[PDB]
């Protein structure tokens, strides 16, 4: 829920709340958490969210988790009011 | 969920003062845009806007709403006001050198983050302020060079905070042992004999004490020093430990 609406209504409708210890071992280890089917309300788009993650996970170190994120950087659409333009912008607005 | 926030803020604009402020606080911050209260309620100088601690990790909010939106709107210096009002130990350090307001650059570079910390003490080299660059590297990473720099701008609090991390005697050994060796090239006895008492060195101050022929008390020559009689000598004893005991009998005291 952390994950979802605090990196994914950056954009749709703000609202963060963040762990900095949490988001610091996240910036070390937070890529693998955010597949859909493992523990979720589902009904959740993560398109800031695969990407800003997967930017956290490059960062700060455990190199591994670095190309693991280089592998899940970003490749998601925005919802269906935006499918006239994020059809091309898919891959564009968010790396 | 459509990325659009139009019916909160409609929301908020319908009963936004009618009594119901926090209907519209609640339905403008949501949707991004509680400027509006700003310049209804906070140009009526609330002063803060609720700056938080720790919850979980950690968590904060600001009067830097106000605050940038007093710079955007033209209020800039009441902004740079606003980052002490919102505690900012970033726009009081950033927006605050950018707009130098020391109320709100050293109050929020006092005990500001090693990022904005480093970034004050960056940004207050140039003017000839190693003070500044020491009370900006005390968890900046720089504080055994600090303890050399603060040895320069004599800060021994701002060294205090400083020596916070490491060795907490006000310095580092350093500064006490660059200080030592002053002290034995003047000669002199007594600072020196405490100081290095202070930086635990009483042998050095043993070489000085009890053949300094001067007075000498129960630390000062009975401590490090084996003995409390600086006669060696009997000629020594009938003329300057006899002016010694001539001056401890004019001191007023009967012990030495």
Redesign the interface.
């Known amino acids: 829920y952390y994950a979802y609406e605090v990196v994914h209504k950056s954009?749709?409708?703000?609202?963060r709340?963040?762990?900095?210890?949490?988001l610091f071992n996240a910036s070390r280890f937070l890529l693998m958490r955010l597949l859909p089917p493992r523990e979720v309300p589902l009904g959740v788009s993560v398109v800031n969210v695969v990407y800003v993650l997967a930017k956290q996970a490059v960062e700060a170190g455990a190199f591994k988790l670095a190309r693991f994120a280089y592998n899940k950087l970003q490749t998601l659409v925005?919802?269906?009011?935006?499918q006239a333009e994020v059809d091309l912008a898919s891959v564009v607005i968010r790396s | 969920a459509n990325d659009s926030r139009e019916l909160i803020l409609w929301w908020g604009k319908y009963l936004e003062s009618l009594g119901e402020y926090a209907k519209a606080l609640d339905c403008y911050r949501k949707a991004g845009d509680s400027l509006s209260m700003v310049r209804i309620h906070c140009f009526q100088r609330d002063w803060k806007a609720a700056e938080d601690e720790v919850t979980n990790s950690a968590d904060n909010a600001a009067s830097f709403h106000l605050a940038r939106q007093y710079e955007a709107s033209g209020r800039i210096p009441e902004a740079i006001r606003y980052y002490t009002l919102a505690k900012r130990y970033s726009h009081g350090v950033r927006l605050a050198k950018t707009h130098e307001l020391d109320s709100d650059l050293m109050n929020l570079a006092l005990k500001s983050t090693p990022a904005v910390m480093i970034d004050t003490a960056d940004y207050l080299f140039a003017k000839g302020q190693h003070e500044k660059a020491a009370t900006l590297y005390m968890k900046g990473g720089k504080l055994s060079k600090a303890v050399e720099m603060c040895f320069q701008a004599q800060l021994f609090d701002v060294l205090q905070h400083i020596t916070d991390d490491m060795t907490p005697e006000k310095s580092d050994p350093n500064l006490y042992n660059k200080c030592a060796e002053f002290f034995m090239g003047f000669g002199h006895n007594d600072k020196a004999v405490k100081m290095l008492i202070a930086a635990q060195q009483y042998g050095r101050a043993l070489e000085l004490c009890v053949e300094h022929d001067v007075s000498i008390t129960e630390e000062m020559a009975d401590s490090m020093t084996p003995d409390k009689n600086a006669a060696v000598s009997a000629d020594e004893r009938n003329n300057v430990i006899c002016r010694i005991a001539k001056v401890a009998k004019r001191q007023g005291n009967f012990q030495l």
């Open positions: 954009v749709h409708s703000p609202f709340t963040t762990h900095p210890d949490t925005l919802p269906a009011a935006w």
